[PDB]
Design a binder for this molecule. Structure first.
Ligand code: MN
Ligand code: MN
Ligand code: MN
Ligand code: MN
Ligand code: MN
Ligand code: MN
Lengths: 175, 175, 175, 175, 175, 175
């Protein structure tokens, strides 16, 4: 099952991302329950906003917040929830929320699944319009959620992203 | 997996519902196969009707028909098949089909996932239009199915629903 | 055509609303071109937000901004662009944008098309969750649009809405 | 515009059908307003049923009910509302509703738009499953509509359908 | 209506394109009937292919085939059929079909509707993957259509495209 | 889970097919990872083509290519990825790709799930239009994939299909 999915083929540049929320989907936040591997509704968002890119996580990783690293994956057509994608990390969006540092990496479909994101290698390569849409999403999606706040610092490059993969991976391996 | 999902956090007012059929979906009846945890097509409905609310079941329960209690869950946007929702039972639709009493509870998204169904506490609280649409669905969806009939008695309140949760839960626990 | 659609059957409580943008649709802003009656793309929104309710206008009206009164219409299922709906005004969201007062009334499907919004008669009747979602939409949809700003004052009642219908209607009739 | 669309190229076997409601669409009944050519919402259906085939009418025809002949058009993929289709009548579903005889012909995409319905030439040719689904739809869609009833007589053949085209066409031509 | 839509604001670099077929839509070919302004089904495609970009035409133009120039418009989200888009021509795909030269220009959303295609100025700017997908579509969509053939020559630049706009525009103006 | 799904109830005429790719879905190729049971993205197709029928495989089978037999299943409405369908084999499309014989059987929904494909018993029974669409799909979907080729031989009957089920089933059982 989905709890036995590797972290990636060659960390940290060839990783697997488990999708929990597809791109352009109704405002429903899903999460895989680490206990059973089941997709669970987390909450219905009250805001009239949608995820700009597919959202998921890298399994067998533990970032600073408590949970696996959170990955946003732009794709040509929306992926299915529970499906796994083979990506390459290209950047990270630093933000501090309740949980404290809660970074969101941005990873693009690996070269073997599609030749379309091969020119994107680092955060300056992603379109400017897509960086501001994600940034704006994260600054406002929990605006109608009392007890939820988020300081969206800024963007960070591919090895800032790749360092968070090893660290989070190593942090989980050591119990 | 989905066969290890609890019945709920605090039975019978805080239960988990495994969704098998989303709201407003094409007429395809799905069911989780209790043997593997796989979603299986049960039948294509011949009628030009669709489920009015998300439909699923409470795991580790055995009602009178043979199967887990059947739950209908109204939500803002359709959920995914195989996903689990955290609900609060509010009523039950009594009906006798081939299998005999085959009640369908109506449960709404728990307070922690959305603040929108907090005013709904019992069956008089659900909109009148939605009770008649469900009722009408259940009276006519297997009309073009030879060997299928259904007497849709009436509606019952939240502790009529909550009694069917304990009873069905207890009935399954005792082998 | 759509340029010959009446303002309503009995102004201001029985009005027609021409839909330009459906509920829960991709972020594309459409507008009927007053010159030909054609639906024209106005802009692609850069934000990851969607209209919370169907959006359109009352024809043969001129509000303060230059254009017909802007109406938001909640419905059970999204309407088509270019289609006309028979509504009853119930409230207004006051906001000042570039254009100055740019109010947005909220009107619900008339009793003859559906019995579901009959209990809603004024702005206190609309669900609290839907008022804050619209309010929040209007406060942030043009956030990634340089040269666009919006002060979302507050909500106003059904005869505040009904006064803006007559005034805007009278303002257009007098050349 | 849509009020200037011919009845057909060669009545009654080569006719045009103006689509008002697509196949497999949410329960919203649309109608072209004969006065402006605008698509207008007629009502939101309360029942959890959807049109089984595209529904529309033949322009410049007047059947017994008051309105143009009503045509159901099965197609591979749902058509757009306001679009016109080139069909060939193959049968008719006799029913008496409030309005009295309110027949619904069934017409299939003409040979020039697709080679797929060429074997269907009369009502015995249409699949049995699709005749019963339409029949069942018409017997129950206005079940939750007080003041609406419908006796669905039976099915009739292609020249029963073709006679209703000429008669309705002639009945409209003579003022 | 749609038969009164200008050719563009400033030919040939600021043109209007009437959309007939949206991006990523079921295989149904639509066309505006020059006689009424109605969208008409032209044919159901038998192939399992879909338009890669929105397809439409520039009104008040006559290319070599008989019809207005044919334009493909890439956009972030699919547009509606019958809607008009404000574009800027960037290239052309030369092909000879039954009709002889039947070029297809590629035009992108004007700067005023979205800042996203501002870097694209000529055919070398469009992604390589999208040129080959369109090219491949046009080489194979009428493969299961007996009596239909197409030699897809190659791609041509923005002033090759802009010359076809003036020529086609001038060719229509002179009766 | 999905790795424990039987091959069928009564091989080879009553088999189970695990769906990986639904009908009429965006061009994303999915595959169940035999190691975890997770749906994995295989590749984004570059071509503007979509699967004509639901695609999946028969578990606990090994054809000549290395993988389980590949099955195409026509259905009234698209199925979900990861769901299992109960079918009856009716034919096979012989083709040699990189992997060598890579046959694709065509199986239709079993009589117990729907009465609609009961007349289809062998490959001459399937509509001609659907055989050519599948055939055409398989001849061109990897056209923009360098290192991918496919000779689509022809069609074969129900016991040619049924022999490939036993053989592939027996070939997997013997380690
Ligand atoms: Mn986090
Ligand atoms: Mn039951
Ligand atoms: Mn305004
Ligand atoms: Mn009628
Ligand atoms: Mn042409
Ligand atoms: Mn194979």
């Amino acid at each position: 099952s989905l709890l036995n999915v590797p972290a990636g083929k060659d960390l940290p540049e060839d990783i697997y991302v488990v999708i929990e929320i597809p791109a352009n989907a109704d405002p429903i936040k899903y999460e895989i329950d680490k206990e059973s591997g089941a997709l669970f509704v987390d909450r219905f968002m009250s805001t009239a906003m949608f995820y700009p890119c597919n959202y998921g996580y890298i399994n067998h990783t533990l970032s600073l917040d408590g949970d696996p690293v959170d990955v946003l994956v732009p794709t040509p057509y929306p992926l299915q929830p529970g499906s796994v994608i083979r990506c390459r990390p290209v950047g990270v969006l630093k933000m501090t929320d309740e949980a404290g540092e809660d970074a969101k990496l941005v990873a693009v479909p690996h070269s073997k699944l599609s030749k379309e994101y091969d020119h994107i290698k680092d955060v300056n390569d992603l379109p400017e319009l897509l960086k501001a849409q994600i940034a704006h999403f994260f600054e406002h999606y929990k605006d109608l959620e009392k007890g939820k706040w988020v300081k969206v610092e800024g963007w960070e490059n591919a090895e800032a992203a790749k360092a968070e993969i090893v660290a989070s991976f190593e942090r989980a391996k050591n119990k």
